Design an enzyme around this catalytic site. Structure first.
Site, PDB file in Angstrom:
ATOM      1  N   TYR A 120       0.792  -1.227   0.000  1.00 12.86           N
ATOM      2  CA  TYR A 120       0.000   0.000   0.000  1.00 12.86           C
ATOM      3  C   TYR A 120       0.833   1.290   0.000  1.00 12.86           C
ATOM      4  O   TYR A 120       2.040   1.269   0.217  1.00 12.86           O
ATOM      5  CB  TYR A 120      -0.996  -0.012   1.169  1.00 12.86           C
ATOM      6  CG  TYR A 120      -0.379   0.232   2.524  1.00 12.86           C
ATOM      7  CD1 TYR A 120      -0.289   1.518   3.050  1.00 12.86           C
ATOM      8  CD2 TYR A 120       0.107  -0.823   3.284  1.00 12.86           C
ATOM      9  CE1 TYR A 120       0.272   1.742   4.296  1.00 12.86           C
ATOM     10  CE2 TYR A 120       0.673  -0.609   4.534  1.00 12.86           C
ATOM     11  CZ  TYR A 120       0.753   0.671   5.036  1.00 12.86           C
ATOM     12  OH  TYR A 120       1.310   0.883   6.278  1.00 12.86           O
ATOM     13  N   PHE A 171       2.105   9.922   3.110  1.00  7.32           N
ATOM     14  CA  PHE A 171       2.291   9.900   4.568  1.00  7.32           C
ATOM     15  C   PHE A 171       2.794   8.559   5.126  1.00  7.32           C
ATOM     16  O   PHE A 171       3.416   8.521   6.189  1.00  7.32           O
ATOM     17  CB  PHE A 171       1.034  10.391   5.317  1.00  7.32           C
ATOM     18  CG  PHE A 171      -0.208   9.554   5.087  1.00  7.32           C
ATOM     19  CD1 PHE A 171      -1.185   9.969   4.189  1.00  7.32           C
ATOM     20  CD2 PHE A 171      -0.415   8.364   5.794  1.00  7.32           C
ATOM     21  CE1 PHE A 171      -2.337   9.218   3.990  1.00  7.32           C
ATOM     22  CE2 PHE A 171      -1.570   7.593   5.587  1.00  7.32           C
ATOM     23  CZ  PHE A 171      -2.530   8.026   4.683  1.00  7.32           C
ATOM     24  N   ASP A 172       2.520   7.470   4.409  1.00 10.32           N
ATOM     25  CA  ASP A 172       2.944   6.134   4.819  1.00 10.32           C
ATOM     26  C   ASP A 172       2.977   5.198   3.622  1.00 10.32           C
ATOM     27  O   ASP A 172       2.203   5.358   2.681  1.00 10.32           O
ATOM     28  CB  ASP A 172       1.996   5.572   5.888  1.00 10.32           C
ATOM     29  CG  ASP A 172       2.665   4.538   6.787  1.00 10.32           C
ATOM     30  OD1 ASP A 172       3.802   4.792   7.251  1.00 10.32           O
ATOM     31  OD2 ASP A 172       2.044   3.477   7.035  1.00 10.32           O
ATOM     32  N   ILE A 184      -7.419   0.133  10.251  1.00  7.60           N
ATOM     33  CA  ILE A 184      -8.521   1.097  10.320  1.00  7.60           C
ATOM     34  C   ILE A 184      -9.789   0.494   9.709  1.00  7.60           C
ATOM     35  O   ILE A 184      -9.707  -0.428   8.889  1.00  7.60           O
ATOM     36  CB  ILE A 184      -8.172   2.453   9.645  1.00  7.60           C
ATOM     37  CG1 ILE A 184      -7.964   2.286   8.140  1.00  7.60           C
ATOM     38  CG2 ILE A 184      -6.933   3.056  10.275  1.00  7.60           C
ATOM     39  CD1 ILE A 184      -8.037   3.566   7.365  1.00  7.60           C
ATOM     40  N   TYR A 207      -8.507   7.922  10.915  1.00  3.72           N
ATOM     41  CA  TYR A 207      -7.840   8.344  12.159  1.00  3.72           C
ATOM     42  C   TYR A 207      -8.531   9.489  12.927  1.00  3.72           C
ATOM     43  O   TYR A 207      -7.924  10.108  13.809  1.00  3.72           O
ATOM     44  CB  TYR A 207      -6.368   8.685  11.888  1.00  3.72           C
ATOM     45  CG  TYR A 207      -5.507   7.513  11.428  1.00  3.72           C
ATOM     46  CD1 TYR A 207      -5.521   7.091  10.099  1.00  3.72           C
ATOM     47  CD2 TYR A 207      -4.661   6.846  12.322  1.00  3.72           C
ATOM     48  CE1 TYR A 207      -4.729   6.025   9.669  1.00  3.72           C
ATOM     49  CE2 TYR A 207      -3.865   5.780  11.904  1.00  3.72           C
ATOM     50  CZ  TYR A 207      -3.907   5.377  10.576  1.00  3.72           C
ATOM     51  OH  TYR A 207      -3.128   4.333  10.149  1.00  3.72           O
ATOM     52  N   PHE A 233      -5.836   5.689  -0.156  1.00  3.97           N
ATOM     53  CA  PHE A 233      -4.888   4.560  -0.283  1.00  3.97           C
ATOM     54  C   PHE A 233      -4.952   3.876  -1.636  1.00  3.97           C
ATOM     55  O   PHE A 233      -6.039   3.687  -2.209  1.00  3.97           O
ATOM     56  CB  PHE A 233      -5.160   3.480   0.757  1.00  3.97           C
ATOM     57  CG  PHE A 233      -4.875   3.900   2.161  1.00  3.97           C
ATOM     58  CD1 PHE A 233      -5.866   4.518   2.931  1.00  3.97           C
ATOM     59  CD2 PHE A 233      -3.633   3.660   2.729  1.00  3.97           C
ATOM     60  CE1 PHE A 233      -5.611   4.896   4.251  1.00  3.97           C
ATOM     61  CE2 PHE A 233      -3.370   4.042   4.046  1.00  3.97           C
ATOM     62  CZ  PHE A 233      -4.363   4.664   4.803  1.00  3.97           C
TER      63      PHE A 233
END
Length: 235
Positions: free
Chosen positions: A37, A47-48, A67, A93, A110
């Site tokens: 991902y 961000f990730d 999540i 979040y 995502f």
């Protein structure tokens, strides 16, 4: 972009397919999924991600290890599918966000690729000897125990061959007298009333080195049972 795939129909998870996957099976609750991902904010900022890492991200689906939007989206994916999902803060979040990388009240995007999924390992050894894929979740929490009288409908396969097809009422602890392998009777005890599942048995939890001539099962055979737990009286 994307269609609304949230259960509440509140536009909180949106899904675009980028690349169609193959086959028909999708992850169920309990299954172990393997994904790659990347996550971006609505301003484009990464961000990730997992692609910097040498290994795939994996987790159990439906057990709340990711999540909420991920639990929902991935259950709609086929193996080899790459999709884009847009996640409102309710399903991500929230108002606090995630202190450094993820700001407060964020809508997240995502890219997720589903690589592989296998079933829940029921063994205490975690040796992969009894694997369960759920086909339909059962009705309520009660699970059969030693001495429970169960009604089941079963089909045993050795590779493509059907060797045993029976509907039976028996007592848990007596199944060894009915040509049922240990591993299957064990797994029955992890099923809820109404549940339909596939149980995969390694030789050790099946009929082992000896096998079972009357069912034409050779030594060292892995077996697959399709089974329904229809009802049960306990103790």
């Amino acid at each position: 972009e994307g269609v609304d795939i949230s259960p509440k129909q509140d536009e909180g998870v949106l899904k675009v397919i980028k690349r169609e996957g193959t086959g028909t099976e999708m992850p169920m609750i309990g299954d172990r999924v393997f994904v790659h991902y990347t996550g971006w904010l609505l301003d484009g900022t990464k961000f990730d991600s997992s692609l910097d890492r040498k290994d795939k991200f994996s987790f159990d689906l439906g057990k709340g290890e990711v999540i909420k939007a991920w639990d929902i989206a991935i259950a709609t994916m086929k193996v080899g599918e790459v999709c884009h999902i847009t996640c409102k803060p309710e399903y991500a979040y929230g108002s606090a966000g995630s202190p450094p990388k993820i700001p407060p009240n964020a809508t997240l995007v995502f890219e997720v690729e589903l690589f592989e999924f296998k079933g829940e390992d029921l063994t205490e050894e975690e040796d992969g000897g009894i694997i369960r894929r759920i086909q339909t979740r059962g009705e309520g929490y009660a699970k059969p125990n030693e001495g429970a009288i169960v009604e089941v409908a079963l089909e045993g396969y050795y590779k493509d061959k059907l060797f045993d097809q029976r509907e039976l009422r028996f007592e848990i602890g007596e199944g060894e007298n009915l040509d049922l392998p240990y591993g299957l009777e064990r797994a029955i005890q992890r099923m809820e009333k109404g549940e339909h599942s596939i149980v995969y048995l390694k030789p050790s939890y099946a009929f082992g080195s000896v096998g079972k001539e009357k069912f034409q099962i050779p030594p060292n055979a892995e077996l697959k049972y399709e089974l329904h737990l229809k009802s049960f009286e306990k103790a």
